[PDB]
Design a protein around this nucleic acid. Structure first.
Ligand SMILES: [Zn+2]
Lengths: 148, 1096, 136, 50, 49, 99
DNA sequence: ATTCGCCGTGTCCCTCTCGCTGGCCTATAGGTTAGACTT
RNA sequence: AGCGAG
DNA sequence: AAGTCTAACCTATAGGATACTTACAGGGACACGGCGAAT
């Protein structure tokens, strides 16, 4: 009964509403615009991008290689391997660490993925929406002002 | 006493007991360990004194362990030997100036040998520029100064821990074997009588499989154990038969997916545990397990890896512990008690010092070296290779370069004092690589385990999120070669306290029975009181018969670090206030006088001398030439030496590092004498602050809730004033559009602003500069849209002062610079920052407070003869803070300032009976000392106060109670009741307001989100976080919140429009939609979540 | 400001290509020397927008009067520099891929919808076992 | 059956279903925890940010 | 600790008694440090409910 | 001119952590010499502040609606009672009690 | 052997805020691009 | 990585 | 000065032939799965 109730919730979510489940499997993946994905030189003119560029680049690399491979015509083993690579890379892109291994850039640091910008404190919600730095402001140490 | 320092001031002491051992070389923990790493001859001599059997340094160790490298074939081999160090390439000062890393080239004899035919190839290979510890124990990396903080870790070994399960209320004992870079392995005894074999943390296994895997037959197991019910139960219920079957099961479990085979199984087991390639529990670990199990006699240790006998010893010990035997007598080994070790205890928590840390880094670098060379031998043909070809330094040096920079222990040297520098050394950092972290650090690992007594500072720890994780070494503490922290002890042998200072570890100290440091020794080594306070094995404190005692502490204050040991009257301060005071003694800024404290302890001298600031006579001699720049001394035999002085050198935290000579041309200097003062020293003693005349009354509320009132005298006379030196640097680079060049030819600008610049375009030395002024003119190739725009280094907002000095580096001078940098300029601007209201002051008792108001000298309380009080403290902070030690401090300080004379009309007063001679009389301003835990008793202090010599006339300002009659300087009538006045030592803390204040009206904005930046280094705002937003919602203030989150910070169109409205005076427009919300929307959309908006 | 609803929901591939102003093909970010975004790269101006206000790749358009016009040789729409912050890209996958959240998040919504199990789904999607689409 | 629904809409649904075929759903009060109460809200922004 | 301390801060604690008092001081500080975070989280949950 | 354009222009004083509603209070600013925000001692208990190095933040409300909110809703003198239980917070404490 | 009811174990999201300081080797066709004269 | 306020 | 007119440079593609074959905390909570009575 309990399993039926849970699965009924999941399916009736689609059934009652007009949202069909076909949108769960992705044929095209969106690309967050560039300024939310910076690429800026700094210090001695050394360019310093973000981590999403690496993840997007990995997805693109896997995709181009897969397209070529299908076009040339290869045994099912290699095309399956490339599809698996694309899958795990899209997973890392959308959510790094959620599956497989955390894709770690140089220094064995898990690269920030699009999901990471939501979870925890450092995410968007708790850091830049529910509290923001403000102009026309200042601070200093305080002292007792008894003549006030 | 004598002080044993050829130039120390005759600071009298209240000490009622003698110190059998003078304080060690407080920087011993660093210098001795690093010299062990290097293998210096002095370390060799010390080892010969203390273990001549096995004298071998750290580098020799890592080389021997690595060597001989062998390929899989084994037809050729490689080896290393004889690590030698050359002289340092550049002197310490030179490297600090020109950014060079003070280091020595390292050379090693590499030997490549062919085994198939027999050949040798000997070479002297260059293994990098090994950084070298300076004389003061600080490394110099890239000019900067850094300190490697000693780390604390859990010693590799065997740990039997017992836990009570609530499911059935039963005690189960589990062992845990910690190797150094090995594989984990646990034995558990669960609810049932099943002995676990969890290997690599995998789903539990029975015991019989492992024993059979090791070749132990069922008959062998049964006959070796004919008593233990649990294990016969396990044998019957193991439901597995055959060593081959056991290996099959082990391989299947440990190697899922692999087709099992018996030879592979045995080889894999041996490789995983017994072969010395992946299981290398270090010499410390082997020592620990041998002691815990008593397998071997105290023979030299070379079989670091584990052994079958060892694991069977652990199994039998564990099962017998479950049975509950008192002691275990292992087969063919020394018997030892059956006890459960505790992780926090210092008998099992080792001090991994600088030597071991750099050794580990070298070991990993050399391991990667070994990997790459073993790879190389396959590609290269034999007979066509030379040790030069085999060795590629890139791993090793990288490790070193990656360790000193960018590490959790190569901490940036913090020196705004000498004490801060000293105490940064001798610091035990429980957190770091291979250690615990803040998230996993519970309350259990942070407490003060009763074994800390003498091996750590129970009082001195940070207050932030590090309480107990970062302690300091005790004064007398010493480090065993194994990394344990020894403490000295005096051995009493049947009521005769002897003089053999024997160093004990935690375990040995627990074995014996140790008495307190202060006890009634009857001038002959015997005790008076029948029973004395005494420590037992687990830290318990009791009374024990006097004849039983066999160990006594060397002296009280053995259980306090350098910092805490300088707090006079520490025996009256609650531990929290003492903790805070010991913390802030590391924060006091160095003033321009630095008067010696009027009341202190014995540590004011040694600390200073060990800090290394004061120039010390290398050899005894006669002074010849004295000058502010340098001192030249005639040595006793012909030769001479010149000591060059660092004047106005910047400190790592912006304070000045002046050194001032204190000798004249004719003086004879003895070896080890103090020749020149440091930043905070005064004739050798540590002078962190000033003796100020303090009253303890609440004065008109200005000293309300910890606030401190100051006399304007301290500003007029310049009692408190620091010289904060800053460092501003700019570099001209080469770009595609052209080459940057600093010069006076700035773009359109008035002639009023080039006055300061000299012909080079940089500010003339000595020219005052203020906010908005130009330091180094610079014009940046403008290219396509003058051929150059404006990019001159302007001093940041709020800064000012004189230009101390200008340093220049030019490509034409063939000087080292980053690629593309035509020139580099460093400008020093120094400000003589005065004392200002809002700044923090504090004593040596954590009696902190800001300067609420600096009254004029006239309208302050004054004594009978018109002496204004230089400071006032609130009275409602002494009692509840439980730090009345400061009150006794200021009482003794008044007694020291005025001078006293005990009248021996009828013998000597009884209260002064214990008082030593030379304290019955003392001239005014006679500096004294009250050691930490034995010192000026209350009765002695009262008696001292009862007879103080009149200052000028027949008038004793302070009565016997320590309280005087203060005349209100604001109104004139006397305060109707007395006031507690005295001389208290207080210091200026490095929290000055000029570095704190900040405002913003429109500054830089981030680019991912258009919110304002954050930080004083930029303009930045102030984070209106979430709790503030809850406050605003609670008030109901909606428009204020809206504009605090929309137009002030985020609405990209809103900011310019509201600024325009304010400037032109129109109404403030309506806020829009936060940009950061748009960014959230775009991110969600880029996450394939169709998040749409509509209002209809 | 006229807000009433945030009706989040599953985004079908049709919507993904509906948002996209172009399609990034190659993983090329910025030129080695001239420091300019490539064509059909992850930053290509034609896809997202001009990196400089009132300019285009070949640069023949610089005035503001002909705003809202896309060049010929390089095909960059002449708009504000800030429009890059909003215009969004997309990439066409050669083979379909599963959204990580719905597949792996516990409980697996995909598995519950399709009556399948978590480890089983991990096996099929990551190419470890086959599944029958249908049979007559 | 067993899904948590706020009291007001529960009563409204009971009243509505009583009309046009009476099958009045009979529920029972439940004591939720604070965190679950925060999550089981009618707005997904607050729950998302919580 | 069943000793217990018998010396007043005015009279001046001996060495072992100070070492004993240190346990209480340190545990109080650590408890405060952690309880502040626990209180903050509870406050956030209450505000959100 | 500054001394004139500041009169009757409230500013919000805040002290992190803002544990309760009283953490933020609007005060009329008056010019002071030195470098430290002078704080009326009575409000200390509201802020939980003790002058031992505490730092506090000043925010400026701009819009006429915001300035009205500062003057009426959040002014210091309009908030003498704790929202918790009505116990006054801006009452003589510590030194004043002894006096 | 399946049903249903219990236990049992494994894998995962959360525990205050606000400041400050420092730190390989070519070969070739086609695309692309530098410089210069001019009316 | 270190530190200040609670 | 853009509009030609002239003269380079630079880079995606491609091409060369001993041999070499398996890397490198803790806590609460829920969901996926042991152990036992019943049909
Ligand atoms: Zn164009």
């Amino acid at each position: 009964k309990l399993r039926a109730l849970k699965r009924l919730k999941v399916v009736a979510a689609f059934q009652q509403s007009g949202n069909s489940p076909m949108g769960m499997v992705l044929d095209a993946v969106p690309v967050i615009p560039p300024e939310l994905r910076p690429m800026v030189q700094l210090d001695g003119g050394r360019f310093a991008t973000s981590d999403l560029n690496d993840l997007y680049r990995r997805v693109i690399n896997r995709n181009n290689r897969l397209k070529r491979l299908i076009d040339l015509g290869a045994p099912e083993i290699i095309v399956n391997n490339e599809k698996r690579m694309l899958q795990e890379s899209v997973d890392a892109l959308f959510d790094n660490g959620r599956r497989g291994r955390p894709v770690t850039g140089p220094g064995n640091r898990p690269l920030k993925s699009l999901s990471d910008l939501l979870k925890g404190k450092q995410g968007r919600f708790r850091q830049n929406l529910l509290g923001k730095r403000v102009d026309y402001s200042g601070r200093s140490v305080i002292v007792v002002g008894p003549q006030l | 006493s004598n002080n044993s320092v050829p130039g120390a001031p005759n600071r009298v002491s209240f000490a009622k007991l003698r110190e059998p051992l003078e304080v060690p070389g407080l920087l011993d923990v660093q210098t001795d360990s690093f010299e062990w790493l290097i293998g210096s001859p002095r370390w060799r001599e010390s080892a010969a004194e203390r273990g001549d059997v096995n004298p071998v340094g750290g580098l020799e160790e890592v080389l021997y362990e690595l060597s001989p490298i062998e390929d899989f074939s084994g037809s050729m081999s490689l080896s290393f030997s004889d690590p030698r160090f050359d002289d340092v390439k550049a002197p310490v000062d030179e490297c600090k100036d020109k950014d060079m890393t003070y280091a020595a080239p390292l050379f090693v004899t590499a030997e490549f040998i062919n085994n198939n035919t027999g050949e040798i190839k000997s070479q002297t290979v260059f293994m990098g520029d090994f950084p070298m510890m300076t004389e003061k124990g600080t490394f110099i990396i890239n000019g900067t100064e850094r300190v490697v903080v000693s780390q604390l870790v859990r010693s590799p070994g065997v740990y039997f821990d017992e836990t009570i399960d609530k499911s059935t209320d039963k005690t189960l004992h589990s062992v845990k074997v910690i190797p150094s870079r090995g594989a984990w392995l646990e034995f558990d005894v669960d609810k049932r009588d099943t002995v676990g074999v969890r290997i690599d943390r995998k789903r539990r296994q029975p015991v019989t499989v492992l024993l059979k895997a090791l070749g132990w037959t069922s008959e062998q197991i049964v006959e070796r154990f004919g008593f233990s019910e649990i294990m016969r139960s396990t044998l019957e219920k193991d439901n597995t038969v055959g060593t081959d079957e056991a290996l099959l099961d082990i391989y299947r479990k440990l190697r899922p997916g692999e087709p099992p085979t018996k030879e592979s199984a045995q080889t894999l087991l041996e490789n995983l545990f017994f072969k010395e390639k992946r299981y290398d529990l270090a010499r410390v670990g082997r020592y620990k397990v041998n002691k815990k199990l008593g397998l071997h006699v105290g023979e030299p240790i070379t079989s670091s890896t584990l052994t079958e006998e060892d694991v069977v010893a652990t199994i039998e010990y564990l099962v017998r512990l479950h049975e509950g035997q008192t002691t275990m007598t292992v087969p063919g080994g020394v018997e030892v008690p059956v006890e459960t070790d505790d992780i926090d205890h210092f008998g099992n928590r080792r001090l991994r010092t600088v030597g071991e840390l750099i050794q580990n880094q070298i070991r990993v670098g050399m391991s990667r070296m070994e990997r790459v060379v073993r790879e190389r031998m396959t590609t290269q043909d034999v007979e066509a290779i030379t040790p030069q070809t085999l060795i590629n330094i890139r791993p090793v040096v990288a490790a070193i370069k990656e360790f000193f920079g960018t590490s959790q222990l190569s901490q940036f040297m913090d020196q705004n004092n000498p004490l801060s520098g000293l105490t940064h050394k001798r610091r035990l950092s429980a957190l770091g690589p291979g250690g615990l972290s803040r998230e996993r650090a519970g309350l259990e690992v942070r407490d003060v385990h009763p074994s800390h007594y003498g091996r750590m500072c129970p009082i001195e720890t940070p207050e932030g999120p590090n309480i107990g994780l970062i302690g300091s070494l005790s004064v007398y503490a010493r480090v065993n070669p194994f990394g344990f922290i020894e403490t000295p002890y005096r051995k009493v042998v049947d009521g005769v306290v002897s003089d053999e200072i024997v160093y004990l570890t935690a375990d040995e100290e627990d074995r014996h029975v140790v008495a307190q440091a202060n006890s009634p020794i009857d001038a002959d080594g015997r005790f008076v009181e029948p029973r004395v306070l005494v420590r037992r094995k687990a830290g318990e404190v009791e009374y024990v018969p006097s004849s039983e005692v066999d160990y006594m502490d060397v002296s009280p204050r053995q259980m306090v670090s350098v910092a805490t040991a300088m707090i006079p009257f520490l025996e009256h301060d609650d531990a929290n206030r003492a903790l805070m005071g010991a913390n802030m003694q590391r924060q006091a800024v160095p003033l321009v006088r630095s008067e010696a404290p009027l009341v202190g302890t014995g540590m004011e001298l040694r600390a200073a001398i060990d800090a290394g600031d004061v120039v010390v006579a290398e050899e005894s001699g006669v002074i010849e030439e004295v000058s502010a720049d340098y001192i030249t001394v005639m040595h006793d035999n012909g030769t001479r030496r010149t000591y060059r002085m660092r004047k106005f050198a910047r400190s790592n935290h912006g304070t000045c590092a002046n050194q001032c000579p204190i000798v004249d041309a004719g003086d004879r200097v003895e070896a080890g004498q103090v020749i020149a003062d440091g930043p905070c020293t005064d004739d050798g003693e540590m002078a962190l602050g000033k003796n100020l005349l303090v009253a303890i009354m609440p004065w008109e509320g200005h000293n309300y809730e910890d606030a401190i009132i100051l006399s304007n005298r301290l500003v007029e006379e310049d009692v408190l004033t620091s010289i904060h030196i800053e460092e501003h640097e700019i570099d001209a680079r080469d770009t595609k559009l052209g080459a940057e060049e600093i010069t006076r030819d700035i773009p359109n600008i008035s002639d009023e602003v080039l006055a300061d610049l000299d012909e080079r375009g940089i500010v003339r030395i000595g020219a005052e500069v203020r906010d908005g002024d130009i330091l180094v003119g610079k014009v940046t190739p403008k290219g396509e849209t003058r051929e150059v725009r404006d990019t001159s280094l302007k001093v940041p907002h709020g800064e000012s002062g004189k230009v101390i000095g200008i340093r220049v580096f030019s490509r034409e001078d063939e000087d080292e610079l980053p690629a593309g940098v035509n020139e580099l300029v460093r400008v020093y601007v120094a400000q003589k920052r005065k004392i200002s209201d809002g700044d923090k002051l504090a004593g040596r008792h954590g009696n902190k407070g800001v300067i609420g108001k600096i009254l004029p000298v006239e309208d302050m309380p004054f004594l009978a003869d018109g002496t204004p009080v230089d400071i006032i403290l609130n009275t409602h902070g002494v009692p509840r803070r439980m730090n009345i030690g400061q009150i006794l401090e200021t009482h003794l300080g008044w007694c020291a300032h005025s001078g006293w004379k005990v009248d021996a009309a009828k013998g000597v007063p009884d209260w002064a009976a214990r008082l030593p001679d030379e304290l019955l009389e003392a001239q005014p301003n006679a500096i004294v000392s009250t050691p930490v835990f034995d010192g000026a008793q209350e009765a002695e202090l009262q008696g001292l106060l009862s007879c103080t010599l009149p200052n000028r006339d027949g008038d004793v300002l302070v009565d016997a109670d320590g309280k005087a009659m203060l005349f209100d300087g604001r109104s004139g009538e006397p305060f109707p009741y007395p006031v507690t006045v005295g001389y208290m030592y207080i210091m200026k803390l490095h929290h000055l307001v000029d570095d704190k204040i900040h405002a913003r009206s429109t500054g830089p904005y981030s680019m991912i989100t258009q919110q304002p930046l954050g930080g004083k280094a930029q303009f930045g705002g102030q984070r209106f976080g979430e709790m503030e937003c809850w406050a605003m919602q609670a008030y109901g203030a909606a428009y204020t919140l809206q504009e605090l989150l929309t137009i002030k910070s985020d609405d990209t169109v809103g900011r310019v429009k509201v600024y325009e409205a304010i400037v032109k005076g129109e109404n403030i427009p309506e806020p829009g939609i936060p940009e950061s919300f748009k960014v959230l929307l775009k991110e969600l959309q880029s996450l394939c979540l169709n998040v749409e908006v509509l209002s209809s | 400001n006229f807000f009433d609803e945030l009706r989040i929901g599953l985004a079908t591939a049709e919507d993904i290509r509906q948002w996209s102003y172009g399609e990034v093909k190659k993983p090329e970010t910025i030129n080695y020397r001239t420091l300019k975004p490539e064509k059909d790269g992850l930053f290509c101006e034609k896809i997202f927008g001009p990196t400089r206000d009132w300019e285009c790749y070949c640069g023949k358009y610089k005035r503001v009067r002909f705003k809202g016009i896309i060049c010929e040789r390089c095909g960059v729409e002449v708009t504000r520099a800030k429009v890059r912050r909003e215009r969004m890209g997309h990439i066409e996958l050669a083979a379909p891929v599963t959204h990580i959240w719905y597949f792996k998040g516990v409980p697996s919504r995909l598995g519950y919808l399709l009556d399948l199990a978590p480890k089983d789904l991990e096996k099929i999607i990551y190419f470890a076992a086959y599944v029958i689409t249908s049979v007559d | 059956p067993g899904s948590l629904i706020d009291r007001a809409e529960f009563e409204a649904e009971n009243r509505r279903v009583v009309a046009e075929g009476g099958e009045p759903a009979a529920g029972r009060p439940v004591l939720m925890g604070i965190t679950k109460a925060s999550l089981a809200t009618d707005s997904w922004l607050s729950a998302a940010s919580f | 600790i069943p000793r217990p301390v018998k010396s007043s801060f005015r009279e001046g604690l001996t060495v072992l008694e100070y070492f004993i008092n240190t346990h209480g001081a340190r545990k109080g500080l650590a408890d405060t440090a952690l309880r502040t975070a626990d209180s903050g989280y509870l406050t956030r949950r209450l505000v959100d409910v | 001119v500054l001394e004139e354009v500041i009169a009757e222009h409230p500013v919000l004083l805040n002290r992190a952590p803002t544990l309760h509603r009283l953490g933020i209070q609007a005060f009329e600013p008056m010019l002071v010499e030195g470098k430290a925000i002078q704080l009326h001692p009575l409000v200390c208990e509201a802020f939980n502040a003790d002058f031992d190095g505490d730092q506090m933040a000043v925010h400026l409300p701009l819009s006429a609606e915001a300035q009205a909110e500062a003057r009426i809703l959040m002014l210091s003198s309009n908030n003498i009672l704790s929202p918790a239980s009505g116990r006054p917070l801006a009452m003589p404490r510590l030194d004043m009690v002894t006096g």
